[PDB]
Amino acid sequence: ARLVGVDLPRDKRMEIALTYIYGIGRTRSNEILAATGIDKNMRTKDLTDDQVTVLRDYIEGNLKVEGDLRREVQADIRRKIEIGCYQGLRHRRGLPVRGQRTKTNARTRKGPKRTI
């Protein structure tokens, strides 16, 4: 299926189909499906348009999803990097902000490994 520009998987359980939406994850999907009363084990083959549309209505009314989320994320990044904050300088240097052990770990943030 398709929703908000997101191609719902051909055959996947809704608990992860809603997870694939960038603004909703595992526990958010669990709470949303609990609230709507929808079974979390059924397959995509039985999906219907009206329930999907009302779910879209609820999620857009109560939450912000996709491009808006991105935009406030980069807005936060730019304001923090402009105000000279510690997190701003860490983003400038491309390093973790919490201040983990940069000695050996943090390869995830530092990206590929290059030898000298």
| Residue pointed to by tokens 């055959």 | 11
Based on the shown chain and the rule CB under 7 A, indicate whether residue 53 belongs to the binding site for RNA: no
Decide if 65 contacts 4 (C-beta within 8 A). yes
| Span 74-93, contacts to another protein by CB under 8 A | 79, 83-87, 89, 93
Based on the shown chain and the rule CB under 7 A, indicate whether residue 71 belongs to the binding site for RNA: no
57, with CB counted inside 10 A (0-12, 13-18, 19+), is: exposed
Catalog residues that contact RNA under the rule CB under 7 A.
12-13, 16, 19, 21-29, 41, 69, 72-73, 76-77, 80, 86-87, 93-104, 108-110, 113-116
